[PDB]
Structure formats: structure tokens, C-alpha cells
Amino acid sequence: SYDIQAWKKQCEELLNLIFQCEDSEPFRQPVDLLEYPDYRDIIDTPMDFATVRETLEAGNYESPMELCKDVRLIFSNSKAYTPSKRSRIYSMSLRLSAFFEEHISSVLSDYKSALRFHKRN
Numbered sequence: 001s002y003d004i005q006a007w008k009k010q011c012e013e014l015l016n017l018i019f020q021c022e023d024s025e026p027f028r029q030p031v032d033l034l035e036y037p038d039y040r041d042i043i044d045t046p047m048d049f050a051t052v053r054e055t056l057e058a059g060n061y062e063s064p065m066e067l068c069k070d071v072r073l074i075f076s077n078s079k080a081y082t083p084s085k086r087s088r089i090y091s092m093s094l095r096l097s098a099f100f101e102e103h104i105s106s107v108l109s110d111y112k113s114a115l116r117f118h119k120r121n
């Protein structure tokens, strides 16, 4: 497919699968500062999957690379805030990251191929 716009619905569908994963539940809404009172000492740019879906639906991503950067920030924030590599929540983040990366690969390749075809002449 050389459809330059196809990534958006493909990302909406992938976010729907991520919301069905039990492994996403900690990452769906912004971290709780009442429960994790030191969170913002450690983490400068909070990110979560509801924020990513809302940014997509607002038309405030120009490319699937920008969406991929924000999703990867969810996972780097979990790794930076974890006290241990054997954390429940960090452990869930690593499975959900593997799932995300397996599915986003074709979305990125197809978009980049479509843009190259657009500038072929």
C-alpha cells in the first residue's frame, strides 16, 4: 500500500489491542502522584496510553514516528521509576513493549515506503 494516511487507523486498531491487554492497565491513565509521591522527582514528562489515543484522535500527530516516540516514553518512564528489574509493573511494561514493537514495525515501514513513493519523481 502507498497510502500516506493509512497509519492512523492502523495505530487506532493497535491502541485498541493494547487496551484489551491486561498488561496495559497500569499505563492507561497518568501515574497517581498521591500513591507515588516521589514520581515527578524521577520523571519529567508523564505519558500514558489515554494521552496517546487523545493526541491521535485530536489530529495532533503528523506521523506514526511521533506516536511511537510517545509510546516508547511510557516504557522508558516505567524503567526509570522502577526500584527493581523484578517489579510487577516494570515486568508488565516489558511484555507490553515487545507486543507494541512487534506490531508497530509494519506501520512504520509502510508509512515510510508511502512517503518515498510520493517523492519518487
Ligand SMILES: CC(C)(C)OC(=O)Nc1cccc(CNC(=O)N2CCN(C(=O)c3ccco3)CC2)c1
Pocket (backbone or CB within 6 Å): 025, 026, 027, 028, 029, 030, 031, 032, 035, 036, 077, 078, 079, 081, 082, 083, 087, 089, 090
Ligand atoms: C484505573 C484508575 C486510573 C481509575 O485507577 C487509579 O486511579 N489507579 C491506578 C491503577 C493502576 C494504574 C494507575 C496509574 N499507573 C501507576 O500508578 N503507575 C505507577 C508508576 N509506574 C511505573 O511504571 C512503575 C515502575 C515501578 C513502579 O511503578 C507507572 C504505573 C493508577
